[PDB]
């Protein structure tokens, strides 16, 4: 099997030698724990004839210090792929707790130190092995992208090159700076999605928050509304049967949900921290969910910098939708905290291994917080738990609770009526917030933005999941929104008609505005340098 790669670097065996030796040399130093790692596993030593069985290729330094001296490697990820074989033999072989695992993670720790500044120095990303999670014996391994000049490998999520935004291939940064040319601009940018009045207000507060309060490590925070569509949903058939038929509640409830996510730039790049789906029930919406909105979920990847900021701004975009939806018309909010399922990820595809998952008594003290927070600024007026609210202006009939998609208590009615239920709802008081915020119609001045990837949280585990855009750490949280918003710049189900915004007409050719939003004069007839698009 052939292809063709004339220009590419390739490294005689003395500057191996002379460049990745110093490393392994790092690890013979390494005393005792070295010791079981300077020869080649003897199974007649130890005792354990289960050995050959279990570890498929051995490895050890000796035997990679031979094929360093005799020139078997010829490119340097060969020999690194040959100490990581190494260290995955014990690590698989001996128990977590015995002795030699832990060896091997020194070893290994020492390792990483120092292969990523010899690798960098050769050219190259690090000199990591990197595997992706389990799902559902194997790992799916990270993937290569190779430079069109050097023919260096590396890794496609270390680089952050991807054939759709650069389309004449990946090249390595500095063939680049021989190039003279610099890397032609990412356009699928966060801040480059489709703005809306809902998703500038979130930013919009959480930046000057961010300012006034001075960190240097801080950077821009974009939100952007991704998704929204009008949706309905149908009672259940317990209450079906006792409700519906009688004419008591209508037998569905409009809503319009909306997803909007957060990113900050963190290296210069976006990386998604944040994301949230709401559902809201306005004006022409009957009893009992008439002028309502509802967090329907939450989630966040903790990777924002500074750490000591980051619950601040998720509290000001929570607090920022109040303020918003408030002004709008909106009367009242419920949240429902309950905290995440073992296994289940809520929006986001892989959370940290160390990100912990709150339980549901720290959770409520997080929404309490951000409540507080709320009615200190005005922009609450109050809020209770369900329990006292409900008993507060009575209620005694099951049609009185709002009715939202995916929420507990339709599925408890349901529940209840094949075979008292005061006593199911007392249990749970404090995970159901009820936030009051305060008449003429509510009216969304945003468009719908139609995009299936988002139109509920499904679609986009399900993806995530298939192309393995984890969120389990910032270099692969950063692939994963690099990725993201591909999908969402290219693929979504929106396409856009162009009109002047003074004679109403639609435009092909006009004169489009320097600073503003979206604004476009037509040509036929405004304070601003305007350049010609379309
Ligand atoms: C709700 C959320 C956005 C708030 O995040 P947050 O402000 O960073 O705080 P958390 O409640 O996650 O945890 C904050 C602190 O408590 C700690 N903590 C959280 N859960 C813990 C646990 N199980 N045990 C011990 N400590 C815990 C964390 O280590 C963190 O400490 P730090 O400042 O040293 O890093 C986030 O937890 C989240 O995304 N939750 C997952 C899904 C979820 O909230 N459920 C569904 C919708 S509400
Ligand atoms: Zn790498
Ligand atoms: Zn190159
Ligand atoms: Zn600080
Ligand atoms: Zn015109």
Request: with cysteine.
């Amino acid at each position: 099997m052939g292809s063709s790669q004339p220009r590419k670097k390739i490294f005689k065996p003395e500057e191996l030698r002379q460049a990745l030796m110093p490393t392994l040399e790092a690890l013979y130093r390494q005393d005792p724990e070295s010791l079981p790692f300077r020869q080649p596993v003897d199974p007649q030593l130890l005792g354990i004839p289960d050995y050959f069985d279990i570890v498929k290729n051995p490895m050890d330094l000796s035997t990679i210090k031979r094929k360093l001296d005799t020139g078997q490697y010829q490119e340097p990820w060969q020999y690194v792929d040959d100490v990581w074989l190494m260290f995955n033999n014990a690590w698989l072989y001996n128990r977590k707790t015995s002795r030699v695992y832990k060896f091997c993670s020194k070893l290994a720790e020492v390792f990483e130190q120092e292969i990523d500044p010899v690798m960098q120095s050769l050219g190259y990303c690090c000199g990591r092995k990197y595997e992706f999670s389990p799902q559902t014996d194997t790992l799916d391994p990270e993937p290569f992208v190779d430079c069109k000049e050097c023919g260096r490998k590396m890794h496609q999520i270390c680089v952050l090159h991807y054939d759709i935004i650069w389309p004449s291939g990946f090249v390595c940064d500095n063939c680049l700076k021989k190039t003279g040319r610099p890397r032609k601009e990412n356009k699928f940018s966060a801040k480059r999605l489709q703005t809306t009045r809902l998703g500038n207000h979130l930013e919009d507060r959480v930046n000057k928050f961010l300012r006034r309060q001075n960190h240097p490590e801080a950077g821009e925070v974009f939100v952007r509304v991704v998704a929204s569509s009008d949706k309905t949903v149908e009672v259940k058939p317990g209450m079906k049967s006792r409700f519906v038929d009688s004419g008591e509640m209508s037998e569905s409830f409009p809503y319009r949900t909306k997803a909007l996510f957060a990113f900050e730039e963190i290296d210069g790049v976006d990386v998604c921290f944040f994301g949230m789906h709401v559902q809201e029930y306005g004006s022409d919406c009957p009893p009992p969910n008439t002028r309502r909105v509802y967090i329907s979920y939450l989630d966040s990847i903790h990777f924002f910098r500074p750490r000591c900021l980051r619950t601040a701004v998720y509290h000001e975009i929570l607090i920022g939708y109040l303020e918003y939806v408030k002004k709008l018309g909106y009367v009242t909010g419920h949240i429902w905290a309950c905290p995440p399922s073992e296994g289940d990820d809520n929006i986001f595809h892989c959370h940290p291994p160390d990100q912990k998952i709150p339980k549901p008594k720290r959770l409520q003290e997080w929404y309490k917080k951000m409540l507080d927070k709320a009615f200190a600024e005005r922009i609450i007026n109050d809020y209770k738990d369900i329990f006292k609210q409900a008993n507060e202006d009575r209620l005694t009939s099951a049609k009185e609770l709002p009715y939202f998609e995916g929420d507990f208590w339709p599925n408890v009615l349901e529940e209840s009526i094949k075979e008292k239920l005061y006593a199911t709802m007392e249990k749970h008081k404090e995970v159901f917030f009820v936030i009051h915020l305060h008449q003429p119609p509510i009216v969304d001045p945003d468009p719908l933005l139609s995009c299936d990837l988002m139109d509920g949280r499904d679609a986009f585990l399900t993806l995530a999941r298939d192309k393995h855009w984890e969120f389990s750490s910032l270099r692969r949280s950063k692939w994963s929104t690099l990725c993201m918003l591909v999908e969402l710049h290219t693929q979504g189900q929106d396409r856009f008609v162009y009109t002047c915004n003074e004679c109403k007409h639609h435009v092909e050719t006009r004169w489009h505005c320097t600073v503003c939003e979206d604004y476009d004069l037509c040509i036929n007839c405004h304070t601003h340098k305007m350049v010609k698009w379309g």
